[PDB]
Design a protein around this ligand. Structure first.
Ligand SMILES: Nc1ncnc2c1ncn2[C@@H]1O[C@H](COP(=O)(O)OP(=O)(O)OP(=O)(O)O)[C@@H](O)[C@H]1O
Ligand SMILES: Nc1ncnc2c1ncn2[C@@H]1O[C@H](COP(=O)(O)O)[C@@H](O)[C@H]1O
Ligand SMILES: [NH3+][C@@H](Cc1ccc2[nH]c3ccccc3c(=O)c2c1)C(=O)O
Ligand SMILES: [Mg+2]
Ligand SMILES: [Mg+2]
Ligand SMILES: [Mg+2]
Lengths: 251, 271
């Protein structure tokens, strides 16, 4: 006997335990355990919010962004910031056309512009222009909000490099290692390449997608990383919200 | 003399250059045009040097660094850093008194019939601060840094830093002035003026100006706005334009160079 779907939802509202795994042998014992775990979840949540107010910290998502960013700069990556608005033409050069399914997920701002659903269009542009100014490899990254109709707003970390690279795949796997280790998630699986933790995809990366330079890139979902690391019971608690703050429900 | 660079020449000089071209005066058109030619070459050269320096010495972004400098200073003062959604509701805008008839309403980017890109951080911050009051009897002090959007030193996407305090100990105006000092000093801009300005949302604000350029609007209340958000105690708050601060501190010739861009990187044009 397990918690009902409704009970799971109620437990996850204020609690960050792993309630789906629990089994009982009696509706009566399920119900008694549920009552106790709901009370513990709620009191634990209240104590946690009372603690943040009393000892404020950098936001958990901001802290994670800083930890990863300082690691990438030490690896030689330039941090860039690009606009949230992108053009329809930019999406089309990404092959996101009325045909592709991602297109139907795009938030349009007007007839010619959209909220970016990924960071790559802008980063490709910046990377290519930076290469106009140097003979060497160019390595950049951005962290920022992306938007898709479904989290509808999520924070992507995208890194990319252009230029000569001995063993592109090995180099890309090392970039992934730098990020994951800096994020506090050193244990993960690789599946052009996907990063999974217990089957949950947290990164998609690839080597080398009219003359072009060698290029590779990796995109991480930072709320997903934070959720896994802090063992929050939903992906809606660690990022931007007016209901949650650093894992705790404020209302 | 009395001859200046033309408006078009000023725009051309500022594309790659961060000098103060609007101050130049010349005897005649020939001397103006000769100086323009020389200064355009200097600007392009200096710009290329800056780009090559950034490539040789990769760094955090200047806007990110400013955001961290100020945020660390506020957390040290006991402010909670929050992050709230970019999307907000039409009702939330109405609660700020941003309704159909108001000028700012015409500046709003709508996502659908009920939701918009936030033009300001106050709507979400009011909600969060009010809910945090449910959990403490003491001061509630929060801030957010994040993109806001307006149809328009103006950008259509800009980064606001908004702070607010519900129930501070002491006079709300002196407390607000001290918080402004913390931010401005942490931003590397200790010299500024505080100027009363009119506001259709707040009635009157205290603005932070540097050489006449607004970089922040701040206010206590007003009471009708607090009551509209179920807040029944003294509140204050301040909203800073981070690109404006960075532009002034780094002496960039336009506000488009230090923030998010596909043409500029930390003051230098890459294309
Ligand atoms: N379009 C914009 N681009 C860049 N910064 C902006 C923009 N609008 C506002 N800001 C910054 O946000 C701060 C707080 O926003 P506020 O609502 O007071 O702006 P505002 O009074 O409309 O400004 P302005 O008179 O300069 O248009 C402003 O002091 C300014 O520093
Ligand atoms: N709707 C979403 N919510 C949260 N994270 C997302 C979302 N879409 C994509 N991501 C993250 O972004 C990464 C790259 O996305 P994609 O470009 O779709 O492969 C994924 O591996 C996820 O971690
Ligand atoms: N005038 C700008 C500046 C502004 C001024 C007063 C404020 N007071 C507040 C009170 C509670 C919650 C948040 C705020 C806050 O954002 C805030 C911001 C704007 O709002 O765009
Ligand atoms: Mg304005
Ligand atoms: Mg103004
Ligand atoms: Mg103002």
């Amino acid at each position: 006997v397990k918690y009902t779907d409704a009970q799971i939802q109620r437990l996850r509202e204020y609690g960050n335990g792993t309630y789906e795994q629990k089994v009982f042998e009696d509706l009566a014992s399920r119900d008694a355990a549920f009552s106790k775990e709901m009370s513990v979840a709620s009191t634990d949540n209240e104590k946690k919010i009372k603690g943040m107010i009393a000892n404020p910290s950098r936001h958990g998502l901001t802290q994670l962004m800083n930890d990863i960013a300082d690691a990438l700069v030490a690896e030689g990556f330039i941090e860039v910031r690009t606009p949230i608005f992108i053009s329809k033409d930019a999406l089309a050069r990404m092959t996101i056309t009325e045909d592709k399914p991602l297109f139907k997920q795009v938030f349009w701002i007007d007839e010619k512009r959209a909220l970016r659903p990924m960071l790559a269009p802008n980063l490709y542009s910046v990377m290519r222009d930076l290469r106009d100014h140097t003979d060497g490899p160019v390595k950049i990254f951005e962290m920022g909000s992306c938007f898709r109709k479904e989290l509808e707003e999520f924070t992507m970390l995208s890194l990319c490099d252009m230029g000569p690279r001995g063993d592109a795949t090995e180099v890309l796997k090392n970039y992934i290692s730098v990020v994951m280790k800096a994020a506090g998630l050193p244990d993960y699986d690789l599946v052009t390449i996907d990063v999974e933790i217990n089957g949950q995809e947290v990164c998609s990366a690839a080597v080398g997608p009219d003359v072009h330079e060698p290029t590779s890139g990796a995109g991480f979902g930072l709320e997903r990383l934070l959720t896994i690391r802090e063992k929050y019971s939903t992906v809606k608690k660690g990022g931007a919200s007016i209901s949650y703050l650093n894992g705790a429900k404020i209302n």
